[PDB]
Amino acid sequence: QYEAGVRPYRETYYDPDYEPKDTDLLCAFRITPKPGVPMEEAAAAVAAESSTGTWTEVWSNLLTDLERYKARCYRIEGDVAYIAYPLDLFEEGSIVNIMSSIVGNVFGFKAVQALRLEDMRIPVAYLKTFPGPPTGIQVERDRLNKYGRPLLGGTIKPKLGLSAKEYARVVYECLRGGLDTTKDDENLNSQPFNRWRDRFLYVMEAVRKAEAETGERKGHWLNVTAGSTEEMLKRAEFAAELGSRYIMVDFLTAGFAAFASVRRWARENGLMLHCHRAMHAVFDRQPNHGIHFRVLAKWLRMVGGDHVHTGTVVGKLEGDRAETLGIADLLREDYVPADPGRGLFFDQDWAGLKPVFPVASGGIHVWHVPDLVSIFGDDAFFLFGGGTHGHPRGSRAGATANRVAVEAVVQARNEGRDILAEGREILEEAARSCPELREAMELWGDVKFE
Amino acid sequence: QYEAGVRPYRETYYDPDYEPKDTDLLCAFRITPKPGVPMEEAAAAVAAESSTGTWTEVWSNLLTDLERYKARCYRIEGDVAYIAYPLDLFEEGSIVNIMSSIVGNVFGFKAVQALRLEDMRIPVAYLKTFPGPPTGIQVERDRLNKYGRPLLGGTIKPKLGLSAKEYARVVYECLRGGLDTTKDDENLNSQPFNRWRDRFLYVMEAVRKAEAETGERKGHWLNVTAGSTEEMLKRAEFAAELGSRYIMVDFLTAGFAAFASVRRWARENGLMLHCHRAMHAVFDRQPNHGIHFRVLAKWLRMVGGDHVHTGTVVGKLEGDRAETLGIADLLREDYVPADPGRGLFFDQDWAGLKPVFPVASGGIHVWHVPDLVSIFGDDAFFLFGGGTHGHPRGSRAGATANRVAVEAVVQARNEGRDILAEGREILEEAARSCPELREAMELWGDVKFEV
Amino acid sequence: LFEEGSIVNIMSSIVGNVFGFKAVQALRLEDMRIPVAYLKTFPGPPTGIQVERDRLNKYGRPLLGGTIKPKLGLSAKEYARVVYECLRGGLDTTKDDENLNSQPFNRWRDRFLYVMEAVRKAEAETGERKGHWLNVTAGSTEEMLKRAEFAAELGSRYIMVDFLTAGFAAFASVRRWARENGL
Amino acid sequence: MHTETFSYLPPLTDEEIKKQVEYILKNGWIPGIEYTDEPGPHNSYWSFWKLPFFNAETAEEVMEELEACREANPDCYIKITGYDNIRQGQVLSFVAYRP
Amino acid sequence: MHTETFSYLPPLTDEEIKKQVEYILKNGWIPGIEYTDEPGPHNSYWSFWKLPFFNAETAEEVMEELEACREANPDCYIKITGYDNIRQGQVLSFVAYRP
Amino acid sequence: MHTETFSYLPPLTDEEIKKQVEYILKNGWIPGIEYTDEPGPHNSYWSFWKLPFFNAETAEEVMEELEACREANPDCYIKITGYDNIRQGQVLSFVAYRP
Amino acid sequence: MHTETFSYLPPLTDEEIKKQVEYILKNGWIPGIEYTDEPGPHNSYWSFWKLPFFNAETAEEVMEELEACREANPDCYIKITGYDNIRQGQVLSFVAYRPHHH
C-alpha cells in the first residue's frame, strides 16, 4: 500500500530551488562528510534527521504534509550547507527545543564525520516568543546609576578554598577600591570550605559597606548555580532577601531549562542575571566540529541573560578579534547585517529584544585596557581577578589601578586620541597620579599572551 | 607581604610525587599543548584553572590551605595527564558543580590547543551523595513484569508532523504488535501540529488499549522536555495523572540542573525516566577535543536516569564496539575495572547505586538482532523506529517482526547455539513461522552500515 | 545496610533490639567507626565552630555562657532581667534550662519576646555581640519549628534543642530549619 | 493473551522447556514454577507451586515438578521462573503450559 | 564620596570638561546639566538645570550654562549628562564641579 | 565599649602585646593589624593596615607596624589578629590601642 | 447504538456507500476501512483493515476491500474513513456494515 524501503535523503531534503521565507529558521553548517558521501546527501541527512525524516520510508509519512514541515538544504557553498527550517517546527520560547532539533542527533551520524553549526538566522516571529534579558543594558545602567564607561568587575581568588568571612574580606577590598562588581568563580557553588548561605550573607555585608564608604552603587555576582533547579531558586531567593542587585548562573552547566527558570525568577524579583559560559569551549573552539559561540550568544540573548562572557582576545583564553566584534554586535544591537569578515553568515534582526552586556575576563591586566576599550567600547564589563588580587599591595590597590586605567583610556578616547596608537602613553600619563597603577604596570609589563 | 607576580603553573599544580587518595576525584585528560608549551605546563594549567589557581599569584592564596585543596597533575603518560581533585572541592550531589570545575574553562586556554576529557574516577564517598536512577533495571523489570530478554521499543515517525490522534494510532499499532514501549522523538515537545497535552491524552488511550488487548504491560516514553523546568514538571504531572508508567527527558538539552529536578519528581510520582542523549555528539564526537560519552554516562547514572541511549555499533550513528561495551558496563555493573583499550582509564566502583538500561537505537533492523543480543545481553532496550513503521505492511507487522527476532535469538542463545556464527540461520528458522519477519528480512537485507 | 543521612536508621539497627536478648545479660555499645562514604551523606553542623566565631566576631578564648536560674518559676519579664544582667556583665550567651519550654508561669512567646529585648540592649550597651539559647524543645516537630520561626523573626542568632528528648528525627528537622533561617 | 518472554514463538515443547531450565541451572540461578487462572497485566503475583527450587540439581527434577503442577492445575497457565539472589531479581520467566 | 565616571581621575579642568561635551555633541547625543547637594547612591534624580539642551549646537553654549549653574549653586555637585534618545538611555555622565 | 578578647583585663602594655604576638608566631599563625573608628558590633570588617603579615619573622617587626598604624590613625581602635590558614579562621584577636 | 455520520438515515445500500467512496476519492482524500465489535463511545481506535488505501484509484477497489472485511469479520461493525493529510485530520467516517445482532 506504500513504497517501503530506503531512499536517499537528498530526494526529499535537498531543494536548491527553495527560497527561504522570512519566518524560516536558517542554519549554516560546515560539513565534513564521510569519504565518498557528497555534500548534497550529507546536508540532506542533517536536514532530514533534524526535522521529520529517518533512515527508511515509513507508511505514516503519508498521514502528514512533509512538504510543509520538512527542513531542507537550499544552498551549498563549498563545505557550508544552508538549511531552512519552517517556523512551525519549533516550540515557542524553548531554546531546549531548538537544540533538540538542530543539534540533537545530527552531529553523531556515520555519514557526517564532523559538523559545525557556524550561525543561525533566528526569524523575528520566533524571537518574539522569547522574553530576552530580564534587565538589559539600559535598565541595568539605570539601576546602577553608571553611564559613560566600561564597568569594572573581578572574580574572587583563589577560585576555591577561602572561608565565607575571608571571601567577603576580599570582596570588600575590591569594591571599596573602585571595582563596580565582584563575582563568585563559576565553580564556587556550595562546598565544605565555603557554604553558600554563609557566603551570601557575608558578601552582602561587604557590598553594603563598600557602597556606603565609596558612594557608588556596588554588586556581587552571587553564584546560584546548583545541582537542581529548586536549589538554584532557593539560592536566588536568599540573594533577593539580602537585597543583592545580582545573581549569577553557569547557564551551560546548569543547562538551558534551569537557566530559563532562573531568568523568570530574576525578572519577577528584580535581580539582574550574570551568565557565565562555563563548558562552552568543549564544543565552540575547534573549527571543524561543534557550535560556534555566536550561536550560543544568540540563544543566551533570547532566554534572557543580562551579561555573558565573550572573551578578551588578548588574555589567557582563546578568542578572535573579528569574530568577537561580531558577537558584541549580536549581543547589543537591534539589527546586525551579515559580514563574512566577522563570520556573520546571516542578517540578524533582534525584534526589539533587550541587549546583553559583553563581559571580557581572563588573564587581563592594566596593559590590556586600551585594547579592551577599543574592541568593546563602553557597554561592557572588564573583569580583573588575578589582575586585581595579584597587585603587590593587594586587592584594594589593584582595584584602584584597574578603575583608573579604564577611566583614563575612556577620557582619552573621548578627547579624540587613538587609544591603540597611544595606549601605553595614556596609561603612563594616568600612572603619574596613581601609584597603584604604576605598580601594576611594573609588575605585569612583561606578561603577554599570543 | 607576599611574592607577587606570574609563576609557571607547574610550580604549584604539577606534582608527580602525589599519591591519589581513595576520596580524590581523578581525571584523565588527553592534552595537545600549544607548540612550545611543555606538557607539564599545559597539564598544570588545566589542574590550576579547574580548581584553585589563576594566571598570577594572589595575596589571598595564603589565607587558605592550597596543599589541601589544590588539584594536582600527578602523572603524565604519553599525551594523557592524570589530575587528582580533593573531595572537598565538590558540592555534594551536584553534577553541575563537577562540570563547572572539570570542564568549565580549561578547554579554552591558549596554552592548550586541544583537550579531551577521556574518563574520571568518581570516588565512592562522593557517589553516595547522589541518588542514582529513580527506578533502576531490577525494579523496572519488576514494574513491567518482564524477565529474560532485551526489551523492545521504537521512536514514532515521521519525527514531527503527525497530529496527536494519528500519532497515537501509530503507537497503538506498534504496542499491540509486540513492542514493549514506544517513544516521542527527542525533538517532539509541544509544537503547532502536535501539542503536548493532546499527544499525552491520546497516546495513553492507545497504551491502555494495547495493554488490555495483548495482556502485556506497555509504556510510551512521553517527552516532557521543555523550555523551563516548571514546564517540564507540569508535563510530568499530567503523564502521572494519566497513569503513564514513563516519562522521557532530553537530559543534555534540558541540562543537568533541570534533569535532577525531573529525576526527583519522577521518583516522587511513580514514573520511570527514559533519558535521551540529544546533543551528546556535539561534545563527544572528536577524539582530540571534547568529553567522551563514557563521562556523560557516569554523570547520567549518578543523577539518576532509568535508561540512556548508548549507541548500536552497527546502526546509522557512530559508536565503536569496544567503547560501547565499556559504556554498557559503566551503566549496569557494581564495579568496572579499568581498560584503556575501551577508554576506561580508571576502575569505577559504583557504591551500590542502581543500574541504568542501555538503549540501542538508530538505523537498526531485524538483521542486526543477533549482533545486538551478543553485544548487550538481556539488560537493554533495542529500538526500531524506521525499522518498525517502515515494514511493508506497517507498524503492527513491523513490531511483530522485531519482537520475534529478539525472542528467537534469545531462545537459541539459551539453548547453547552460537548466535554470531548462526545468526542468519536462527532468523531464517524463525521467519518460517513469522511472515512479518520474513518480509522485514527481505526488505532490509541489503541495508548495512560500516562497523 | 544503612539509609543515607539517617541517624534514626543507624539506631534502629545497631541499638534496636539487641540489648534485650535473653542470651546477652548486659550489652554496652562503646564506639562505632562511621565510614567516610556514609559520613558524606550527612550535612553536619548548620554553622560549625569557625563560621560561628565569624558570626560572633569572637576569637582567641573560650566563650562564656550560663543557664538562667531558678530553672523554672520566673516570669518572662524577670527571666529577661536576669538575661540582661548576665549579658551586660560580660557573658557572651545565656540559655533556657533544658526543661524550660512553655509552661503556665513562663510561656514561650512571652519569654522569647522579652529575652530578645534584653539581648539587644546588652549588645548595644557592651559593644559585643550577644545571644540567648532560646529553647524551642516542644511536644511535636511542628511546634518546635513554630518556636524557631519566632526566634528568627526576632533576630536571635541562636535557638536551642534538647536533641535526645525531642529525638533524632525532629532534631534533623530543626537542624535543616536552623540552617535555612540563619540560626 | 500474550505471556511475555517467548510468547511470540511457537509454544515450547518439553525438550525446549528443558533446555531453558538447563540454562537457568547452568548460570547458578534458582528455578521456580508459578501458575494462575488470571494471567493478565494486573497480576504481579501468580500462585507458587511449592517454593523456588533452591535444592534442585537437575533440569529433570524441575520438569517432574512442572508435570505435577500441570496435573494439579490443568486449567491454569504455568510459567517457569529463574531467580538470581545476587541481583535480587528474576532473570528469566516464560509460560510452559497454557490451558 | 566618589561620583562615578572619571571620579578616579584628577578633577577635570574646564578644557577637559569641554572636550567631553564636544564628544557628546559629535555623537549626536543631547547634553544636559544636573545638580544636587545629595549626590549619594540613594539619589537617582538630581535637579535639572533647565531642560536637556536639545537645541545646543556648540560645546561653548553648554559651558556657559555650566558656569551659570555653578554661580547659582556653588554648594552643589554639578554633573554633565549626555542622552541618546535612540537607545532611550544616558550614555555619558560625570561630575564637572564639586563644592 | 568592650572589644572582645582581653577587654575585661587592664589595657595591655607594649610588653604584654608583644607576648601575644610571640604566641601567634610560635603557633605558625599569621599576625595582622586592623583599625577602625567604628568598633561596634555592627562592624565585621575593620580597615586592614597593609596586608596580613605573611612574611613576618619576629614579633618586633609586628610591633613596629603597630606603632606605624597608631601614628597614622591615632583616632582609631587598633587590633592585633592572628590567622590560621589551615582552619581558614582567626584564632586570636584583641585590641592593642584605644584612642 | 448510533454510529455517527449517516446513522440517522436509513442504512446505506452498497450503491449509496460507493457514492460516498467516490466523494472521498474525488476530493483526493485517502479512503480507509476499520472494524470493531465494540463500537461505543469509549472506543477511539477501531481495528484497521490493512492500511489506509493510499494507492487506491477507484471506488470499486475500496468496495472490494469492504466486502473482504465483512466476510472475514461478519460479527463486526465496519466503517469507511476518508483522511486528508494536508489538514492531518479525518474528513468523513460512516458505518457501512452493521452485524446481524445490531
Ligand SMILES: O=C(O)[C@@](O)(COP(=O)(O)O)[C@H](O)[C@H](O)COP(=O)(O)O
Ligand atoms: O576562572 C577564571 O579563570 C575566571 O574567573 C578568570 O579569572 P582571572 O580574572 O584571574 O583570569 C573567569 O571565569 C574566566 O575569565 C572565564 O573565561 P571566559 O570569560 O572566556 O568565559
Ligand SMILES: O=C(O)[C@@](O)(COP(=O)(O)O)[C@H](O)[C@H](O)COP(=O)(O)O
Ligand atoms: O531520531 C532518531 O534518529 C532516533 O529516533 C532513531 O530513529 P530510527 O529508529 O528510525 O533510526 C533516535 O533518537 C536515535 O537513535 C538517537 O541516537 P542515539 O540512540 O545514538 O542517541
Ligand SMILES: [Mg+2]
Ligand atoms: Mg572563573
Ligand SMILES: [Mg+2]
Ligand atoms: Mg529520535
Ligand SMILES: [Mg+2]
Ligand atoms: Mg539545665
